[PDB]
Design a binder for this molecule. Structure first.
Ligand SMILES: [Cl-]
Length: 242
C-alpha cells in the first residue's frame, strides 16, 4: 500500500525547489511519498550508481576489498578530493567518478549488463559509453525502483555474495549516533535534463528500518546540501529521527 502526503511539498517549496521523497516502512510494508507521479519517473542514477557498480566490482574481483588503493592517475581534476589515492570507502564518500569509471571498464559491457538485469536495476539499459552510461547514457531509475533495489541489498538478497553486500553497506555508512544509522549515497546528474540531485539509502532504528529515496531539481550546485536537509526534515516531521 502507498500513501501520498502532499504536506511534504512544503519542504521543497520553502526552499524554492521541487522534488520527491519516497519513504518505505520495512516493518509495516507501507510506502509514503509527496508525489506519486515523480516517485515513479525515471532519471539518470549518476553517482547513486556507485552502489551497484561497487557490488559488481567486488563480486568479480575487480576490487579485492575495501582497503585496496586506487592510485590517482596524476590528472588534475576540478574536484580537489579526487586528486588523491582512494579506497572503496573514500571513493564512495567523495563520489570519485574516475575511480568508478575504471571499475566499469574492467567489468566490461557484457558483465555489467548481465548484472544489472540480475539486480532488476532500473531500466537495466547500459546503452552509451561503458565508462559514462550512468551519467549520460540510457540507464534510468526511479525513486521507487531505488527503494526496491536497496531493500534487496539490506537483506543480502541481491545475486552477489553476502560478502560483497556487506562491504558495500559498510561503504555506504554516512551517519551514526545513539539514535539512528544512515547508510546512503548521493547523486548529482547534470549532463541530461532535468538536472537533479539524489539521496537514496535507509535509516536503521533499534526496531525498524526506513528506506528512502529522494530526488530534486538542481539547476546549480548551490542547492546540493538540500538533498540531505530536505530528506531529514521529512524524517523529523514523520518522527523517524529526533
Ligand atoms: Cl558498518
Amino acid at each position: 500500500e502507498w500513501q501520498e502526503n502532499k504536506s511534504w511539498n512544503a519542504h521543497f517549496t520553502e526552499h524554492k525547489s521541487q522534488g520527491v521523497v519516497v519513504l518505505w516502512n520495512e516493518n509495516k510494508q507501507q510506502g509514503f511519498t509527496n508525489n506519486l507521479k515523480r516517485a515513479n519517473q525515471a532519471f539518470l542514477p549518476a553517482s547513486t550508481f556507485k552502489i551497484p557498480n561497487s557490488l559488481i566490482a567486488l563480486d568479480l574481483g575487480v576490487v579485492k576489498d575495501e582497503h585496496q588503493v586506487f592510485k590517482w592517475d596524476g590528472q588534475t581534476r576540478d574536484i580537489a578530493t579526487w586528486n588523491r589515492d582512494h579506497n572503496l570507502i573514500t571513493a564512495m564518500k567523495y563520489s570519485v567518478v574516475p575511480v568508478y569509471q575504471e571499475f566499469a571498464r574492467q567489468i566490461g559491457e557484457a558483465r555489467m549488463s548481465k548484472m544489472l538485469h540480475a539486480f532488476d536495476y532500473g531500466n537495466e539499459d547500459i546503452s552509451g559509453n561503458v565508462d559514462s552510461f550512468w551519467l549520460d547514457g540510457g540507464i534510468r531509475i526511479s525513486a521507487t525502483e531505488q527503494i526496491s533495489f536497496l531493500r534487496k541489498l539490506y537483506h543480502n538478497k541481491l545475486h552477489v555474495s553476502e560478502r560483497s553486500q556487506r562491504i558495500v553497506k559498510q561503504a555506504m555508512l554516512t551517519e551514526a549516533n545513539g539514535d539512528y544509522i544512515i547508510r546512503a549515497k548521493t547523486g548529482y546528474s547534470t549532463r541530461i535534463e532535468p538536472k537533479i540531485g539524489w539521496w537514496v539509502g535507509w535509516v536503521e532504528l533499534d526496531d525498524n528500518v526506513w528506506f528512502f529515496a529522494m530526488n530534486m531539481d538542481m539547476p546549480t550546485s548551490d542547492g546540493l546540501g538540500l538533498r540531505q536537509a530536505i530528506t531529514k526534515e521529512v524524517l523529523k516531521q514523520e518522527k523517524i529521527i529526533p
